[PDB]
Structure formats: structure tokens, C-alpha cells
């Protein structure tokens, strides 16, 4: 438990062993569980010394200790990571990636992961210094199972951080370079490696449809669905995020998701006790019901409409908003037969009960869905019966109240509904 | 993310 003053005294000595002991003391100080004195270490001007120690091939222990200390400094605020980067640490860590000592290369991997995880600027800077090639060289083995577990986990997490963040998204050539190894890792058995690989894929699929296409071309969707059917929440969460991102794309990518059998997992997802899982799954379903009519039909065949009715009847309010969106997309793109099936499953009463919420957007979505169902009934001539249903569940009173809403669109649409049908 | 070493709607 040295003081920063003693650490500085030792590091400023012309004795490599005293410097090593002071650097180890700094590492232990920065590795304590409560409030590491990162700012105090920075103010003492110690980062340049640690960076210089990173290059002492003659003394591997001081390399390791300084790498650990700099890793922990770079794990803090953006200003602290920036202090690490300004010391010239990026190229030193990249040079250490090829060290013959596995623990030192692993520490360099960790440090680069923190730096890249700061944000898109430092991510792209790490990429410009040439980290991807040595990082992937570390994983160029016939069987990943021969690598140490922690080493593989750290490599996967750092790679995921290189795939992370937008504005801008990672360089396309870098994504193309990394994706094959990402597929390999996505077929690994370790739960943490799988979780971090799924997170990386979720990052890569979060953007324009061209990036989604880069990912889907690798054939990972079946594996993503298999992982979606996993037991570990830390794996299901990123897998579900990636699947949702993918189905935000073209009808062909959504169809790739459907063909892999994803819908068969949604009975559980739409009833998952974790609210975030339910919300993400309902959002995915809403984007799926915004697709082609055969895709809505596949949603119907898997028996998911009753699950949407359930989520609409009882769930977190945000999940209910996602379900209202799903219903509006369904009724906007669906055939008259599918809309009638939706009505037969009991959508009217929950959709009308949700009109009492103090949220304008869900109100407008629900009114659009009601208009679509009424158009279907008109096409069938059952508008009268549907109005009877809406009146029995107390919904006519809700639309009558919406008449006097503080939003133009809401009042206008409620008026149109009551005058064109009621 | 950062780690310390111890010891269609595109948006929802």
C-alpha cells in the first residue's frame, strides 16, 4: 500500500529493480477495489514512464507491471484513457501483442480493448496503428480450445470493442478482416466468449442494411438463432439484439432470420420474466410484422398472435408500446384474413384499454391500427359488428374522450373514427 | 465497455 510519493520516488530512481518495485506498487494501488487513485497517478506524470517501461524487452516483469497499471488507468474516464493514449501507449501495446510471454500479450490485448472501448475515435486510431493483424494472428490456431480460457475471453472482448460504436461505424475493411474470426468464435463453447461474440455481431448489425448484409453473408443467422435458444441470459440478450437488428433490414434478411427457425423461440421470449428480453422480443416481432404478407403468415402459423395479445394485455408499458407498434404494422401490411384472425384472437379489448395511457405516440399507433381493422371490416362488410365490439369493451368512450385530446392528429383521428363508423 | 483488472423501426 505505497503512497504515490513513494511510487514516484522509486520510478524516478536510476535503478531498474527499484523502478520495477515501484511500478508493481502502482499496479496494486490501481487494482484495489475501492476508488483507485487514477487521477493522482496521472498528475504525478507517471504515464510516460510506464509507456517507456512497456518497451523494456530486457525486463519482462516491468513490461507486465506497467501494462497492468496502464490498463487500469485506461479503464476509467475518457480523460484518463486519453491520458494513456497521449503517452504513446497504443503502438507500445501493439508491439507487446507479439510478446513471447502470454500474460504480457494478454495484458496488451486488455489495454487495447479499454482504449478502443472509449469510443469510435480511439477505436479507429487503434485500428490505424495496425492492431487487427496481430490480434487475429493470436487466434490463428486449429482449435481455439487449446488457448487459455481467460486469454480467449479477453481477445474476444477486445475484438468486440473494435466492432463497437457508430458515428462512424468501424471501417468496412476492418469489419471484413475481423468477421471470419468472429464466426469462428461464435461457434466456440465458452459462454463468455459466445456472449461477447454475439455482442460484437449485434454491434455490426446495428446500422444500414449494407452492414447487416456483410454479417448475414457469413451465414451466422442459424447460429444466432441456436444461441437465442440458450439458457444463459448473457447469451440470449445479445443474440436477441442481433436478431432484432437483422430483422430491421430488408425482407430478404428478415426471411433469412425466419428460415433459421427464430419464431419457434418467441413463445418463451415474449413471456420471458426479464422485462428487457420481453421488450426486445416484442420490438423484433413488430419489425417482423412490418414485412411481407407471407412473413406475417409465418408469424400467424407459429401461434405468436395470441402471445402478442397477451403482451398487449399485461406487460411493462414499453413492451406494450412495442406490441402496439407490432399490431399496427400487422394491420397495415396484413391481408383481410390475417386482420380478421387478429380480431378473433382478442386484440380489440386490450388495444382499447391501452388508449387510457398518458402517452401520445401509443395513442396514435393504436388509432392507426383501429383504422386499419375498420378498413378490413369495411372490405368484409362487418364494420357494424366491429363497432359493437369496440363499444362493448368500453372503447367507444375512450375514443370519445380522445376527441378532446391536446394533439391535433389524435383528436382528428378519433373524430374520423367515431364519425365514419360509430 | 471498459474493464479494470483486479487482484421498419431501427430503434425501439
Curated annotation (Swiss-Prot), chain A:
Ubiquitinated. Deubiquitinated by USP22; leading to stabilization and increased activity. ARM repeats lie at residues 1-37, 38-77, 78-119, 126-170, 172-208, 209-248, 251-290, 293-335, 336-382, 383-422. GO terms for molecular function: DNA-binding transcription factor binding; nuclear import signal receptor activity. Signal peptide: none annotated. GO terms for cellular component: cytoplasmic stress granule; cytosol; glutamatergic synapse; host cell; NLS-dependent protein nuclear import complex; nucleoplasm; postsynaptic density. Residues 68-164 are annotated as: NLS binding site (major). Transmembrane segments: none annotated. The keyword Cytoplasm applies. Heterodimer; with KPNB1. Component of a complex containing CSE1L, RAN and KPNA2. Interacts directly with CSE1L. Interacts with PLAG1. Interacts with APEX1 (via N-terminus). Interacts with FRG1 (via N-terminus). Interacts with ARL4A, CTNNBL1 and NBN. Interacts with ANP32E. Interacts with SNAI1 (via zinc fingers). Interacts with SNAI2 (via zinc fingers). Interacts with BAG6. Interacts with AIFM2; this interaction likely mediates the translocation of AIFM2 into the nucleus upon oxidative stress. Interacts with RSL1D1. Functions in nuclear protein import as an adapter protein for nuclear receptor KPNB1. Binds specifically and directly to substrates containing either a simple or bipartite NLS motif. Docking of the importin/substrate complex to the nuclear pore complex (NPC) is mediated by KPNB1 through binding to nucleoporin FxFG repeats and the complex is subsequently translocated through the pore by an energy requiring, Ran-dependent mechanism. This is Importin subunit alpha-1. It comes from Mus musculus (Mouse).
Curated annotation (Swiss-Prot), chain B:
Disulfide bonds: none annotated. Binds DNA as a dimer and can form a homodimer in the absence of DNA. Can form a heterodimer with JUN. Heterodimerization is essential for its transcriptional activity. Interacts with SMAD3 and SMAD4. Binds through its N-terminal region to UTF1 which acts as a coactivator of ATF2 transcriptional activity. Interacts with the HK1/VDAC1 complex. Interacts with NBN, MRE11, XPO1, KAT5 and CUL3. The modification N6-acetyllysine is found at residues 5, 10. Belongs to the bZIP family. ATF subfamily. It is found in: Nucleus; Cytoplasm; Mitochondrion outer membrane. The nuclear export signal 1 (N-NES) negatively regulates its nuclear localization and transcriptional activity. Transcriptional activator which regulates the transcription of various genes, including those involved in anti-apoptosis, cell growth, and DNA damage response. Dependent on its binding partner, binds to CRE (cAMP response element) consensus sequences (5'-TGACGTCA-3') or to AP-1 (activator protein 1) consensus sequences (5'-TGACTCA-3'). In the nucleus, contributes to global transcription and the DNA damage response, in addition to specific transcriptional activities that are related to cell development, proliferation and death. Phosphorylated by PLK3 following hyperosmotic stress. Also phosphorylated and activated by JNK and CaMK4. The gene is ATF2. Ubiquitously expressed, with more abundant expression in the brain. This is Cyclic AMP-dependent transcription factor ATF-2. It comes from the Eukaryota.
